[PDB]
């Protein structure tokens, strides 16, 4: 707690705070760059950033080259993240995976599929697993630790619920032990617990339609300012509007 | 009427006597249920469905395995009814006119297109007409019961509404007779009056992007709660996400 | 200034003042009449017309045959223009174009590509470009006429952003001048300042499922009236339906 | 702010509260492991870690095998870490750029030494590099952009400060822009502000005779509780002595 007392004051600004101390990061997919084909790409929208308010060595430019790449080994590095997606219609739920983890803030501990079968708890216990290739069969517990349509015993009687993703969000019927059985070699997964959003990327959607469904749920379909869309021409184009506007995507962040 | 005092009592609960008393229905798609490959699927969904709260003769499994065949033979058997429904991208309308028929209240009367050429009154009155295949021509009518563009002696001369659909809901200039043509062999056409919504099913719609448009209009567009959406991964994962959020689905219809 | 005093007393219909003096003007694509088949389709839905009250040489029908050809050529005729745009993926950002022109109140000079360098002002002064093949390239110059990733001598330097499109809505990082290479041969290019909307069109989507993201930016989304959607079936259908709604259409818009 | 009133009471051990809710991580050599000679080791120690209080499941034993590798790979896992280090007297500055790391709280983002020169602002502005092998050659710039002692276009000419090292905080005249070059290929360097100490790490020393200079500095010289020594006679001897005072390296952490 705060006092709430009406002293009425804005303090002016708040912009000129954010172009002194903060760092701006680009995260871009490869096709993005090789459209530009230029070698001062970066070198030129960097002096446009000036414009708009960015000293010199404020500003990054990362390139993922995949959404399923960039789903996995995106640790964000800088204060404030601004991230390009161009509809890929195939990848849509690759996509839905991966905004759900940079637009929001996740607590996770580590998970030994060998030796305890596990359960979640609440809309926001989730099983975040990432990496080469996550393929995941599991094998619901009654409360005796016995198979329900399954044998603790066979993975073949499990039930796949991830084939060779690189970044997965499994979902299972909270409050029931399973079994899991993951491809540890080429995957990892984690216990992980939702909540916090972020106050950063600007997951910036490039094409389609869109509308998202982000939920893991039916029933709730939540549209948050950290959810931008721009319409596809060049990508010089997407690229100038990001800077034209940085202030404005930055203003729907912050922190 | 009621009486409108605010004893302000809130009785307790409201799942604890649907979980006694009602009838849950899924239905799915054959593609869903081959996906999951299982000879005891419906059976381990039912014992992870005690978890949520109902008895064991409580949830019943309906296959339709087509939206097309769905939309027809669609008596909806349960209590409470959510339908699992899988973005298919050219059926689009087959789904809207279906959604448009479950998600709604209807009122129908036989009309006989041999004897009588009829006329819509509101923005309520549409002409419903579903079977192997629907063939539906018409030819509008001046105040002599002349046609207008067409001679209501040769069919030639008709303008075709629908070539050969499962289900389809029919709309025309209203306060206009009109000589209908539908191919009565294998079409029953009827006259229906609009209303009341649906208190039950849910449709859940996998994949794509959606806002769906059901309006017969331009200028509306209704977003209901018995309208939900799914992110697609694996048909697993759908089922276990509707047990694992049975009551959210239920409490977004009732009665 | 109205003085504000609430006498309260709505002067009755509005719709009865519009059916006598105002003219409304349908835009369909030629696929949509090809569709219909009929030498006297045009004059069927105009007798069908004075059903929903608009006298018989009050409605006039013009063909665009191309999204393309109608965002340069479209010189909107009537008092209400009602133009109808189904769903062709592939031409999304030229149909997002097109649509922002008609929706919109545009104000326009013309642009000497030749002898002086531009620079837009503010997020509404945007660079509208149209004709047979549009092919715009853009130098960024610093506070000196000089390139900034580019040789103000060279266009094989500048950075191309629109590839022989025939309606082109341009956006550059604001307060920038730039020295442009437009293909002014086959395209003319424009400089407008963005505003008051529009009081007629009423821009009626077939198919898909959409969602608009008709800004320059990523931070908003605007949702007019004059922005409708219909669910496809056949053409016939569409045309009974604007006609069934004309009004309802027509209240959308007005002036 | 907290109230300051001296009510007086304090609460009970502390002690009891992290045995039950914190985990121990202890970070040694190979060299340490080697001499023990044990296939039990981990083991023993651990049911002796039950009499100092920490339930089964709580110590772990995190192996790095030089302190080059440890440096860079050292992703500190546990609550409280405690990492044994021996002294090797060609390595001390290793040791001393790795316990500066550890021992105290870093905030860093990344630098693109492709496209920007940089500069240090405080006494606690430094650049943090780690890698394969981290090879720097600086050079100054005047406020012209030009080299003080080196061409900015011959590397040759610039000034080495790292000769692949495996960890480094390089320290350079503050206030001062440089181009940099390092060896990308097999280092990383990133610009880190310093600060926060650390509440965990215990760099516990074997061997010498120590008086240790962790600042850049040479006015200064701080010495922490996080910061203890051993006199080696055994790598047995040392564990036992890490047990049998496990809560006072503890209590000298905390958080
Ligand atoms: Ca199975
Ligand atoms: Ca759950
Ligand atoms: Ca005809
Ligand atoms: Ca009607
Ligand atoms: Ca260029
Ligand atoms: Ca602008
Ligand atoms: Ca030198
Ligand atoms: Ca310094």
Same mark, same amino acid.
């Given at each position: 707690?705060?006092?709430?007392?009406?002293?009425?004051?804005?303090?002016?600004?708040?912009?000129?705070?954010?172009?002194?101390?903060?760092?701006?990061?680009?995260?871009?997919?490869?096709?993005?760059?090789?459209?530009?084909?230029?070698?001062?790409?970066?070198?030129?929208?960097?002096?446009?950033?000036?414009?708009?308010?960015?000293?010199?060595?404020?500003?990054?430019?990362?390139?993922?080259?995949?959404?399923?790449?960039?789903?996995?080994?995106?640790?964000?590095?800088?204060?404030?993240?601004?991230?390009?997606?161009?509809?890929?219609?195939?990848?849509?739920?690759?996509?839905?995976?991966?905004?759900?983890?940079?637009?929001?803030?996740?607590?996770? !501990?580590?998970?030994?599929?060998?030796?305890?079968? +596990?359960?979640?708890? &609440?809309?926001? $216990?989730?099983? /975040?697993?990432?990496? *080469?290739?996550?393929?995941?069969?599991?094998?619901?517990?009654?409360?005796?630790?016995?198979?329900?349509?399954?044998?603790?015993?066979?993975?073949?009687?499990?039930?796949?619920?991830?084939?060779?993703?690189?970044?997965?969000?499994?979902?299972?019927?909270?409050?029931?032990?399973?079994?899991?059985?993951?491809?540890?070699?080429?995957?990892?997964?984690?216990?992980?617990?939702?909540?916090?959003?972020?106050?950063?990327?600007?997951?910036?959607?490039?094409?389609?339609?869109?509308?998202?469904?982000?939920?893991?749920?039916?029933?709730?379909?939540?549209?948050?300012?950290?959810?931008?869309?721009? !319409?596809?021409?060049?990508?010089?184009?997407?690229? +100038?509007?990001?800077? &034209?506007?940085? $202030?404005?995507? /930055?203003?729907?962040? *912050?922190?």
């Amino acid at each position: 707690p705060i006092t709430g007392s009406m002293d009425t004051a804005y303090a002016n600004s708040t912009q000129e705070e954010t172009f002194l101390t903060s760092t701006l990061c680009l995260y871009y997919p490869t096709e993005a760059a090789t459209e530009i084909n230029d070698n001062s790409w970066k070198d030129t929208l960097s002096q446009l950033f000036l414009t708009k308010g960015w000293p010199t060595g404020s500003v990054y430019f990362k390139e993922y080259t995949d959404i399923a790449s960039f789903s996995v080994d995106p640790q964000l590095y800088c204060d404030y993240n601004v991230v390009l997606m161009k509809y890929d219609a195939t990848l849509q739920l690759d996509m839905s995976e991966l905004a759900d983890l940079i637009l929001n803030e996740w607590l996770c !501990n580590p998970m030994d599929i060998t030796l305890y079968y +596990y359960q979640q708890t &609440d809309e926001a $216990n989730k099983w /975040i697993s990432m990496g *080469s290739s996550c393929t995941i069969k599991v094998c619901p517990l009654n409360t005796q630790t016995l198979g329900i349509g399954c044998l603790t015993t066979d993975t073949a009687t499990f039930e796949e619920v991830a084939t060779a993703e690189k970044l997965v969000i499994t979902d299972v019927v909270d409050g029931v032990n399973h079994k899991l059985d993951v491809t540890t070699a080429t995957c990892t997964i984690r216990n992980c617990k939702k909540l916090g959003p972020r106050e950063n990327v600007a997951v910036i959607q490039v094409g389609g339609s869109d509308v998202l469904d982000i939920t893991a749920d039916p029933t709730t379909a939540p549209q948050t300012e950290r959810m931008m869309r721009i !319409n596809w021409k060049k990508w010089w184009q997407v690229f +100038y509007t990001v800077v &034209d506007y940085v $202030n404005q995507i /930055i203003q729907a962040m *912050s922190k």
